[PDB]
PDB file of C-alpha atoms and ligand atoms in Angstrom:
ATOM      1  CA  UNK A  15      53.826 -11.719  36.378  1.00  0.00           C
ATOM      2  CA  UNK A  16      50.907 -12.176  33.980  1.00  0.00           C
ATOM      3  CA  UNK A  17      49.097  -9.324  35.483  1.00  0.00           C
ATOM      4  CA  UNK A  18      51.585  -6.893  34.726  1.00  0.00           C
ATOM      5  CA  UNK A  19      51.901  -8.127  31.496  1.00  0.00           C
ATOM      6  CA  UNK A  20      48.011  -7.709  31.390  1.00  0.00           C
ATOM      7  CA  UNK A  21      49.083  -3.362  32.067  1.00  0.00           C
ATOM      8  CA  UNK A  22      52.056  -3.436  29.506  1.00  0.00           C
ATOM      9  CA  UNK A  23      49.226  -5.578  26.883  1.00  0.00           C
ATOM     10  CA  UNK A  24      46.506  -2.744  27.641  1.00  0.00           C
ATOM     11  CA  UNK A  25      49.208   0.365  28.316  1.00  0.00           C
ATOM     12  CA  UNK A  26      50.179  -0.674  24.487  1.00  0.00           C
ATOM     13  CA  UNK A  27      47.034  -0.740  22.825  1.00  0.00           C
ATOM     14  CA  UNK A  28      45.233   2.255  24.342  1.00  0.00           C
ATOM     15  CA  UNK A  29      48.364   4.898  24.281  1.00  0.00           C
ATOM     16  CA  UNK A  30      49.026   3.730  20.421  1.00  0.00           C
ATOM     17  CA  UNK A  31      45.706   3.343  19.096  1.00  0.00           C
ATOM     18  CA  UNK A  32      45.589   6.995  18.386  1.00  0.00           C
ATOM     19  CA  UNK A  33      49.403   8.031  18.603  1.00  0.00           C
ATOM     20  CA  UNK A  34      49.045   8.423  14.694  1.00  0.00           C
ATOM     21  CA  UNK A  35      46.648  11.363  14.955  1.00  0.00           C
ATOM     22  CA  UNK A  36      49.255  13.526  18.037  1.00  0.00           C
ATOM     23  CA  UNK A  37      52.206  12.232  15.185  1.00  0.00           C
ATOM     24  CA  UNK A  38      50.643  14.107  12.591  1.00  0.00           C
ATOM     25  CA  UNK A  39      49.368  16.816  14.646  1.00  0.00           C
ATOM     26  CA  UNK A  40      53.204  17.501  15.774  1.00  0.00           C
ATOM     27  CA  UNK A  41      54.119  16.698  11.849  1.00  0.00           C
ATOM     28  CA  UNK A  42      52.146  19.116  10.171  1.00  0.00           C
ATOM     29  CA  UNK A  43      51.429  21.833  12.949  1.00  0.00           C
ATOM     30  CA  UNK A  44      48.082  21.494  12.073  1.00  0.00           C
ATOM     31  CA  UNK A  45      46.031  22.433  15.456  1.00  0.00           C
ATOM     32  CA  UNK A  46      42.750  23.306  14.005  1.00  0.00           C
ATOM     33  CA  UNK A  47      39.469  22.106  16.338  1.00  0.00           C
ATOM     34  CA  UNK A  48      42.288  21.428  19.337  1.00  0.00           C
ATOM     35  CA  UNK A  49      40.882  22.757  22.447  1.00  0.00           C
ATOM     36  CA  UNK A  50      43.018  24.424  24.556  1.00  0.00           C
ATOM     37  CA  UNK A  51      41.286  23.827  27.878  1.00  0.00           C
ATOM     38  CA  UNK A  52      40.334  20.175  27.199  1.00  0.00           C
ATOM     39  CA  UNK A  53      44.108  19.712  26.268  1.00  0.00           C
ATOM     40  CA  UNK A  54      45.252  21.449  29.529  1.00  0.00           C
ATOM     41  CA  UNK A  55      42.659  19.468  31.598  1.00  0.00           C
ATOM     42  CA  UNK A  56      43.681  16.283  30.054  1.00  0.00           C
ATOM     43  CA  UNK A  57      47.774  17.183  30.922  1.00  0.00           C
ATOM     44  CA  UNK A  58      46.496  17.569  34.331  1.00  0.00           C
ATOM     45  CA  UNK A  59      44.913  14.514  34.974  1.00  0.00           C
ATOM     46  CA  UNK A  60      47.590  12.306  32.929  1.00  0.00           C
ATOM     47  CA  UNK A  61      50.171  13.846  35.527  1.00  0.00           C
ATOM     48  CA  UNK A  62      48.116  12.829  38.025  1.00  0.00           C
ATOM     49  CA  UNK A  63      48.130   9.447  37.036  1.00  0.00           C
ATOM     50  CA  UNK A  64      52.028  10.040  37.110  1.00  0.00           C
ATOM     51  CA  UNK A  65      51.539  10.791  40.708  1.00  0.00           C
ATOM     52  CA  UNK A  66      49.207   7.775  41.221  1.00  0.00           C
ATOM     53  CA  UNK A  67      51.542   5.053  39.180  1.00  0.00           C
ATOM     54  CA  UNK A  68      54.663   5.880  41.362  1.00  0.00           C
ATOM     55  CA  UNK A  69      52.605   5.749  44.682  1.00  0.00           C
ATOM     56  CA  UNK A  70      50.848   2.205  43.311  1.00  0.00           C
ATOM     57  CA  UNK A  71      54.313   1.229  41.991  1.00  0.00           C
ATOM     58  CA  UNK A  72      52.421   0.225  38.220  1.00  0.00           C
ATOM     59  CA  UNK A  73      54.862   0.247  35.659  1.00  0.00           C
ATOM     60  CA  UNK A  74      51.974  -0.383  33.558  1.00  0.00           C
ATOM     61  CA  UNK A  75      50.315   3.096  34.620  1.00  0.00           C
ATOM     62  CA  UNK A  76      53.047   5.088  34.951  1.00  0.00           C
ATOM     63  CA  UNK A  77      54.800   4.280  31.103  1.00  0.00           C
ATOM     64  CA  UNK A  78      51.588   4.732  29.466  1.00  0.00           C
ATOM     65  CA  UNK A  79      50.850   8.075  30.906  1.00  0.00           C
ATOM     66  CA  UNK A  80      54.924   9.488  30.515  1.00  0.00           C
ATOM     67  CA  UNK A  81      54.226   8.265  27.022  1.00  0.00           C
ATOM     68  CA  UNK A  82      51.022  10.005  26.660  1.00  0.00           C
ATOM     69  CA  UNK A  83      52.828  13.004  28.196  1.00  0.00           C
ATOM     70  CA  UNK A  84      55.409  12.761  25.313  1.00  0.00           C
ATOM     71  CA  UNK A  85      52.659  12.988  22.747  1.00  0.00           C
ATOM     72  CA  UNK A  86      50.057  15.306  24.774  1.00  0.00           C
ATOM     73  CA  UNK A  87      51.897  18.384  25.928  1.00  0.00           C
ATOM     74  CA  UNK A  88      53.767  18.798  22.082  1.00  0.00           C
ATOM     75  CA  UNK A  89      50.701  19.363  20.514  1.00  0.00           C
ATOM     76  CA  UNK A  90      49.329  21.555  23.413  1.00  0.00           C
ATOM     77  CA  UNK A  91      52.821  23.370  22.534  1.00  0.00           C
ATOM     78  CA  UNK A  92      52.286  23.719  18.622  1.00  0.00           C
ATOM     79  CA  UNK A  93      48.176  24.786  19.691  1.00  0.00           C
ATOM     80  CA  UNK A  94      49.496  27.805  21.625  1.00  0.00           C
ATOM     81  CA  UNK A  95      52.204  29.324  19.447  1.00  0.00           C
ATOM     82  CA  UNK A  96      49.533  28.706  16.383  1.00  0.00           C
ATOM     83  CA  UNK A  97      46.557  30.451  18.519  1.00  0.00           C
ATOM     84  CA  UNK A  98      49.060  32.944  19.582  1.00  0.00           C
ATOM     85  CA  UNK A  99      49.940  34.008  15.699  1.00  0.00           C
ATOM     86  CA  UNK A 100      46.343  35.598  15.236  1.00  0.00           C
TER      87      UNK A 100
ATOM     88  CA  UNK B  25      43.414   7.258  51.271  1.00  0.00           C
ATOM     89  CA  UNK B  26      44.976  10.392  49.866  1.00  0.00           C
ATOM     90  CA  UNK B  27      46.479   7.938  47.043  1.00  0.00           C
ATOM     91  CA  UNK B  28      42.985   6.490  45.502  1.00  0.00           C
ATOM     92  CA  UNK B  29      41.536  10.097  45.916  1.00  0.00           C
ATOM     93  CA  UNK B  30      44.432  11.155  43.696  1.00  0.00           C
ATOM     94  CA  UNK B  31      43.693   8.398  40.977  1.00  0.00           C
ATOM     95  CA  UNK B  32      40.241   9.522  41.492  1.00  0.00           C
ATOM     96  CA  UNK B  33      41.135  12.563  40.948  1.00  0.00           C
ATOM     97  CA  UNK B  34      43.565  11.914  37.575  1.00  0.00           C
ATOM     98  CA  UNK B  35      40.316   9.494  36.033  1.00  0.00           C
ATOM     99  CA  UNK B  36      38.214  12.335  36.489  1.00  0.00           C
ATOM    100  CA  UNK B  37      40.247  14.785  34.291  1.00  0.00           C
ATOM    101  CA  UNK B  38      41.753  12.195  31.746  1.00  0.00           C
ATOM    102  CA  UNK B  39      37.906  10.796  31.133  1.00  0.00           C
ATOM    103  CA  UNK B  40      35.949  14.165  31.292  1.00  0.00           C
ATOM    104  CA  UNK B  41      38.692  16.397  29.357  1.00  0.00           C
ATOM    105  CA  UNK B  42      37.242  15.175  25.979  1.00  0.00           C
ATOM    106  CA  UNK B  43      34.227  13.525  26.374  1.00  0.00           C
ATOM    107  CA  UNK B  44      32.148  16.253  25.256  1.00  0.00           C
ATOM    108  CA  UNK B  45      33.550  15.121  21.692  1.00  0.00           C
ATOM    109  CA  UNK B  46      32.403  11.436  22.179  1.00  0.00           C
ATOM    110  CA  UNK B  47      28.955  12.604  23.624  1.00  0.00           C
ATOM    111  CA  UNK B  48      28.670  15.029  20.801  1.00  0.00           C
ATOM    112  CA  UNK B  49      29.316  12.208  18.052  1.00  0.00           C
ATOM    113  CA  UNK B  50      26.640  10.021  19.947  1.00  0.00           C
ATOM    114  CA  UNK B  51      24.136  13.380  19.505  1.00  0.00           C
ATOM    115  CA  UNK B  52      25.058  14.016  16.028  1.00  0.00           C
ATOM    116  CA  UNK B  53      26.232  10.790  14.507  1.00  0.00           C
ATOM    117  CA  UNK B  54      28.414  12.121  12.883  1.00  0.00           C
ATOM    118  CA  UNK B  55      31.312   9.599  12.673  1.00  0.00           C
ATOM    119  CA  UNK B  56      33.747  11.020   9.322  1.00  0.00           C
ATOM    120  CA  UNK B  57      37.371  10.610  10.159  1.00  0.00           C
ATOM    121  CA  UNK B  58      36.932   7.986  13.177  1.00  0.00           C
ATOM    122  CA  UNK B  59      39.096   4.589  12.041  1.00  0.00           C
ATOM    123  CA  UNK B  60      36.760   1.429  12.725  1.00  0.00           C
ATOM    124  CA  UNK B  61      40.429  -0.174  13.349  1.00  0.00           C
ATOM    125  CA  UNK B  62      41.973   2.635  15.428  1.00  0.00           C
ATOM    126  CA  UNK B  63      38.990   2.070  17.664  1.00  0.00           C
ATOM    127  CA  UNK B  64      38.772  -1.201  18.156  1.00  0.00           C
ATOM    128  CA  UNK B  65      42.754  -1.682  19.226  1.00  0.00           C
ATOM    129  CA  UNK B  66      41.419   1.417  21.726  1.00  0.00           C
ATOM    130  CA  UNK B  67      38.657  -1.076  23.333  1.00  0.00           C
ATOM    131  CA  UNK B  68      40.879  -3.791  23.046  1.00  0.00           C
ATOM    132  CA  UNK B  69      43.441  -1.685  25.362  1.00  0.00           C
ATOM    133  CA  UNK B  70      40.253  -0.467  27.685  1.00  0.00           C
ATOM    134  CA  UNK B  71      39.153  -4.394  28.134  1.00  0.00           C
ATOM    135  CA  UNK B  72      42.296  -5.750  29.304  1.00  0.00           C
ATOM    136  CA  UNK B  73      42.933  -1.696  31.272  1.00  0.00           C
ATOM    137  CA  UNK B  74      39.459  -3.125  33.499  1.00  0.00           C
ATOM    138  CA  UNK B  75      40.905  -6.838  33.725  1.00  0.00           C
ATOM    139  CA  UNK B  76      44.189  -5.011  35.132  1.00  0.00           C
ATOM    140  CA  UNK B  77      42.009  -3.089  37.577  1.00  0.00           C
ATOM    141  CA  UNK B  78      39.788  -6.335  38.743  1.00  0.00           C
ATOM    142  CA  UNK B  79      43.597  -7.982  38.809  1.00  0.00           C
ATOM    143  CA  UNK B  80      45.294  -5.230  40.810  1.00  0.00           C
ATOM    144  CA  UNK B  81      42.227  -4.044  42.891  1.00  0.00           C
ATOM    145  CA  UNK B  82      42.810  -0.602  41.529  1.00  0.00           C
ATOM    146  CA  UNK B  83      39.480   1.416  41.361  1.00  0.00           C
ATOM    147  CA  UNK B  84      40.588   4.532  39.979  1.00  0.00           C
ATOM    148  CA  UNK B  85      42.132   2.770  36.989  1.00  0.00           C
ATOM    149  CA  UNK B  86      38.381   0.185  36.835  1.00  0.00           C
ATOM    150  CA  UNK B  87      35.846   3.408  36.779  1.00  0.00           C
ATOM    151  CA  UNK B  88      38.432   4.968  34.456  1.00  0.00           C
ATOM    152  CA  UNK B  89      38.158   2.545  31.604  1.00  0.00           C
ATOM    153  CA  UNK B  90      34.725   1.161  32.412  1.00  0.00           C
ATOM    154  CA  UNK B  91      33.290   5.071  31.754  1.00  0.00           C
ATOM    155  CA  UNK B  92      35.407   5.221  28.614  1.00  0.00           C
ATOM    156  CA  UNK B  93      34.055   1.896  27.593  1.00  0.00           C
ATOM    157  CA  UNK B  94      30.565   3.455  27.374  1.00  0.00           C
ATOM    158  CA  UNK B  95      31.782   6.458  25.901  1.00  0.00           C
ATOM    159  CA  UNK B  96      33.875   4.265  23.025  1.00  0.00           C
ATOM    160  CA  UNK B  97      31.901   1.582  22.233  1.00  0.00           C
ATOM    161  CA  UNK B  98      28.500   3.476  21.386  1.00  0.00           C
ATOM    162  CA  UNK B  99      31.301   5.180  19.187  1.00  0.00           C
ATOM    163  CA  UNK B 100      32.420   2.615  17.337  1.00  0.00           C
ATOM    164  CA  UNK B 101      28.779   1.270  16.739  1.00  0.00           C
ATOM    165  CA  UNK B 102      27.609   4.308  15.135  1.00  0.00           C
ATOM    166  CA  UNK B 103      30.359   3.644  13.467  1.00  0.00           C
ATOM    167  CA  UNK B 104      29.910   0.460  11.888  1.00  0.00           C
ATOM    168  CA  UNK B 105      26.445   1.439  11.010  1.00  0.00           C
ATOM    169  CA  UNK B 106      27.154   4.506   8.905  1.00  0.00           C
ATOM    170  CA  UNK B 107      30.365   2.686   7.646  1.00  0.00           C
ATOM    171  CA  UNK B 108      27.513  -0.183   6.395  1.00  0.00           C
ATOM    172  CA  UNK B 109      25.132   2.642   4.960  1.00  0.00           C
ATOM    173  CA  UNK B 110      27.504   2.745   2.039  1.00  0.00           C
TER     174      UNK B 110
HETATM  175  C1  OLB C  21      44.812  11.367  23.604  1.00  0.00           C
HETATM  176  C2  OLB C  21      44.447  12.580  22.780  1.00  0.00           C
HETATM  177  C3  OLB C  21      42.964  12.834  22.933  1.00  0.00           C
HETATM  178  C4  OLB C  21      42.384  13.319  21.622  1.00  0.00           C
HETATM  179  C5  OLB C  21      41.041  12.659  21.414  1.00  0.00           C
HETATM  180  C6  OLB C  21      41.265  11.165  21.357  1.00  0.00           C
HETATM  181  C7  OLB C  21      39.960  10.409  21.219  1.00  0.00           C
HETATM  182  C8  OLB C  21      40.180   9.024  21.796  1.00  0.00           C
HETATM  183  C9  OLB C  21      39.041   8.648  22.717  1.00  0.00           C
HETATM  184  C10 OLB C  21      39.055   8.975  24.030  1.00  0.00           C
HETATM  185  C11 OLB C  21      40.202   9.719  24.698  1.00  0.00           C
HETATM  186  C12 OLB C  21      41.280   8.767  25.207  1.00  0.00           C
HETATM  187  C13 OLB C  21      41.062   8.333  26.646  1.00  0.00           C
HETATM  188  C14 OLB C  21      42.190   8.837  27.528  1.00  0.00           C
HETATM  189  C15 OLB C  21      43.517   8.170  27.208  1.00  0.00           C
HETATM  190  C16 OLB C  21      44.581   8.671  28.166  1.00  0.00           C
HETATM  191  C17 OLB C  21      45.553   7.563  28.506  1.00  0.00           C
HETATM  192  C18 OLB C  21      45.702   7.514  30.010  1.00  0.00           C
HETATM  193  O1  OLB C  21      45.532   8.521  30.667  1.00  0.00           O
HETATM  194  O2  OLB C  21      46.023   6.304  30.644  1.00  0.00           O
HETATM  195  C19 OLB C  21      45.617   6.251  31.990  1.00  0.00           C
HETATM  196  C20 OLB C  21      45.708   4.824  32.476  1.00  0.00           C
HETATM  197  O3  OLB C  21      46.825   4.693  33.320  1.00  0.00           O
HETATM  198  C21 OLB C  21      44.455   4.476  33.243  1.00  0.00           C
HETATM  199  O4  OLB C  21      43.544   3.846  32.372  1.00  0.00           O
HETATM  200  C1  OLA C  22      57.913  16.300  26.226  1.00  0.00           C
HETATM  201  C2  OLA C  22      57.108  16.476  27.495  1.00  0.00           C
HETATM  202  C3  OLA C  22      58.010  16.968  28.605  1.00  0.00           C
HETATM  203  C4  OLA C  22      58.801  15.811  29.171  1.00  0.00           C
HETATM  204  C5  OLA C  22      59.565  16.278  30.392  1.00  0.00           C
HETATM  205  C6  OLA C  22      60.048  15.088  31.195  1.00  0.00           C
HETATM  206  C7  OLA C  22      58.890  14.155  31.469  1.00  0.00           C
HETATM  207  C8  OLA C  22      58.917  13.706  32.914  1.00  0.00           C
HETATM  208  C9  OLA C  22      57.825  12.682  33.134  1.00  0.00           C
HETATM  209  C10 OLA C  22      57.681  12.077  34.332  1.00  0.00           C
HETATM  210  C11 OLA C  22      58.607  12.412  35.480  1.00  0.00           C
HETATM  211  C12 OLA C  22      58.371  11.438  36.613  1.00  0.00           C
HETATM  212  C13 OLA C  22      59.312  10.260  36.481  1.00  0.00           C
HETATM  213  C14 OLA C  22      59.049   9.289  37.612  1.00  0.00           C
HETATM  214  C15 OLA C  22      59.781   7.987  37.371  1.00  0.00           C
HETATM  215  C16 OLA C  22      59.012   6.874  38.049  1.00  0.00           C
HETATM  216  C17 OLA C  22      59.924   5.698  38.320  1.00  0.00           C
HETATM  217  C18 OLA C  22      59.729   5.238  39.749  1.00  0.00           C
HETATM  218  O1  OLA C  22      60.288   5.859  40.690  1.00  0.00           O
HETATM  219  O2  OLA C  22      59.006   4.237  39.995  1.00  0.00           O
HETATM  220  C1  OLA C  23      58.109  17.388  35.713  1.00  0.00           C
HETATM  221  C2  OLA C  23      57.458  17.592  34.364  1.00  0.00           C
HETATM  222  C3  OLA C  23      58.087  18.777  33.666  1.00  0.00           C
HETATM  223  C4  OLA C  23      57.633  18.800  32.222  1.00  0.00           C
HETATM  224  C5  OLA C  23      57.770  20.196  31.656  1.00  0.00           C
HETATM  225  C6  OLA C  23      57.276  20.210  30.226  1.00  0.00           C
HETATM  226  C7  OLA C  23      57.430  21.598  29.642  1.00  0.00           C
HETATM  227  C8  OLA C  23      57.386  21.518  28.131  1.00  0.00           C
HETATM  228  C9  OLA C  23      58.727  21.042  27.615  1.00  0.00           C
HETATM  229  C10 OLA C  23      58.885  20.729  26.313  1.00  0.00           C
HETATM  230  C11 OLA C  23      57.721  20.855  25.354  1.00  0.00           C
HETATM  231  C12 OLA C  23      57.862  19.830  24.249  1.00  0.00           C
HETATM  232  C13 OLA C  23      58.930  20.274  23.274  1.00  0.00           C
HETATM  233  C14 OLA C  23      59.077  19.242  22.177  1.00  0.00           C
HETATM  234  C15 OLA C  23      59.364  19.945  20.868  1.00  0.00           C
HETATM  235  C16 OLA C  23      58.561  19.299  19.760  1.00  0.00           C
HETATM  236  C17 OLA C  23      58.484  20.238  18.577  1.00  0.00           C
HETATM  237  C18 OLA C  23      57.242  21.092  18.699  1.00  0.00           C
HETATM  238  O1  OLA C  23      56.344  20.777  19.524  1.00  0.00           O
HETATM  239  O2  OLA C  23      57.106  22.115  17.978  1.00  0.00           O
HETATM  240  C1  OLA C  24      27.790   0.472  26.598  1.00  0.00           C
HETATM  241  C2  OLA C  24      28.996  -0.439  26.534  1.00  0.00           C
HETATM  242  C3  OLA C  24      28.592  -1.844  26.922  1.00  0.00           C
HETATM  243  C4  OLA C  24      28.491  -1.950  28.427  1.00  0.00           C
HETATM  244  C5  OLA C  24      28.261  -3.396  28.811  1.00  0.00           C
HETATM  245  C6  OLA C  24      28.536  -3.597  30.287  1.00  0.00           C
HETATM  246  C7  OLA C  24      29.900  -3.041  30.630  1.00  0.00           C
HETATM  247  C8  OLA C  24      30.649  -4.013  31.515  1.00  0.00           C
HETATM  248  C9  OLA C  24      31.958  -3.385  31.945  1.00  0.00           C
HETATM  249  C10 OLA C  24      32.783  -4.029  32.795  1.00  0.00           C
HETATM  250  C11 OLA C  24      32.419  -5.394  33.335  1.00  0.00           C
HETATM  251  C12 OLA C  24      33.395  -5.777  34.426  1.00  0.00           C
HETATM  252  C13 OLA C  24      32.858  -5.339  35.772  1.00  0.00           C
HETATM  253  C14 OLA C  24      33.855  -5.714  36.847  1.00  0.00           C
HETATM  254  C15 OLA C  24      33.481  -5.067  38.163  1.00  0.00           C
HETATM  255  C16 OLA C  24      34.744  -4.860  38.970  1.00  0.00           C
HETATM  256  C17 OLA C  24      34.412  -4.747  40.442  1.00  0.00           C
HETATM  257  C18 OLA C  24      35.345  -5.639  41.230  1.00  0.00           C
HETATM  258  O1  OLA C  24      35.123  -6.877  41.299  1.00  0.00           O
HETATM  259  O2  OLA C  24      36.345  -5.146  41.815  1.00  0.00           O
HETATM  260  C1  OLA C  25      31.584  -7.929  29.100  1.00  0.00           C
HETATM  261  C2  OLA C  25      31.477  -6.742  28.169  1.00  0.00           C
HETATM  262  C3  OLA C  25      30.303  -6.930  27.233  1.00  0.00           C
HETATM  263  C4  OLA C  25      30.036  -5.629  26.507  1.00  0.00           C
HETATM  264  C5  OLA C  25      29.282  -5.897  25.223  1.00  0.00           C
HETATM  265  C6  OLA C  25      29.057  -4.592  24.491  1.00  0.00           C
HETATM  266  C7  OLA C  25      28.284  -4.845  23.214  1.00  0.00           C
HETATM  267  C8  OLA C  25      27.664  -3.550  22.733  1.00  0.00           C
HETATM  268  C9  OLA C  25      26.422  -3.256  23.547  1.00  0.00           C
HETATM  269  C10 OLA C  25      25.790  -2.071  23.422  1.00  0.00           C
HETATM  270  C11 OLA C  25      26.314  -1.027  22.460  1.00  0.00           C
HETATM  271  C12 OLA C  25      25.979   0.354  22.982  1.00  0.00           C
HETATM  272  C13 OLA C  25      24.511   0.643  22.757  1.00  0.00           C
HETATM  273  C14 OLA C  25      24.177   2.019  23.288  1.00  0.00           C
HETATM  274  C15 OLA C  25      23.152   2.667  22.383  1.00  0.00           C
HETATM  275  C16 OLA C  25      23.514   4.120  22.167  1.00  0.00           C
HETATM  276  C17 OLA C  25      22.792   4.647  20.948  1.00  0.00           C
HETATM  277  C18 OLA C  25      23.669   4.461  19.730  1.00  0.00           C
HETATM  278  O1  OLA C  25      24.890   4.185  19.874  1.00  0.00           O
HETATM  279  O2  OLA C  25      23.180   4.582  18.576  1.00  0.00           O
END
């Protein structure tokens, strides 16, 4: 009870503590200094956590990487059409 | 077996993808744009991410955090110390 709790406390503070800089990112299209590859390896091993909550059955793992996902792969998105303009 | 190889697996890519910018702020010092507060709810979140690990005997999810721990907190200290130059 207290433990999961413990996931949603930490799931909370780590996914939002930077959410405002993706949120602006997305905002203002602004993708300059993004790296492509670090953003595609990072996808890859929050899907993989995906993977790992469902087979651990953490709630606590699994919400804070779909969330992460939500916020990760838009600005990957916005970093490819912008490199893709030059 | 195949399951803590694949959280293995997802820490290795979540920690790794950008910590060539954390490493690179320890080099440089160079700390401009990084929130004192914005950090410290991220350590807050990576504390209680370890206690969930001890709590849920979840290794992938303990070596995950503890890494980014001493990749955040020297961070946040250099931080604090050019913040305090001023
Ligand atoms: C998130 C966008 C990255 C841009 C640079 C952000 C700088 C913040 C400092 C370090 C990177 C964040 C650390 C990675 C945060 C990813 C969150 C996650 O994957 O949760 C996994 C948990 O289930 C297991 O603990
Ligand atoms: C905006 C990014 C693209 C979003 C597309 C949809 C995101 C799908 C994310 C995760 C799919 C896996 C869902 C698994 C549910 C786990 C629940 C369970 O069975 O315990
Ligand atoms: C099973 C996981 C499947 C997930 C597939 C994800 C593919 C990407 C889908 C949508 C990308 C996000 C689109 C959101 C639009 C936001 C506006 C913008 O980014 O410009
Ligand atoms: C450079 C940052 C400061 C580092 C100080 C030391 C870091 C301590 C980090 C975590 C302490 C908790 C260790 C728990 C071990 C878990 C093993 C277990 O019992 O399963
Ligand atoms: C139980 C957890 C206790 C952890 C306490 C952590 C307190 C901070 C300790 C050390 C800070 C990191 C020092 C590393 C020096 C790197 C050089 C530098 O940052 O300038």
């Amino acid at each position: 009870d207290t433990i999961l709790l413990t996931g949603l406390f930490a799931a909370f503070f780590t996914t939002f503590a930077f959410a405002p800089q993706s949120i602006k990112t997305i905002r203002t299209r602004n993708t300059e200094g993004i790296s492509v590859v670090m953003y595609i390896m990072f996808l890859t091993g929050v899907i993989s956590w995906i993977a790992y909550g469902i087979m651990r059955s953490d709630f606590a793992v699994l919400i804070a990487n779909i969330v992460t996902l939500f916020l990760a792969a838009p600005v990957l998105v916005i970093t490819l059409i912008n490199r893709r303009k030059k």
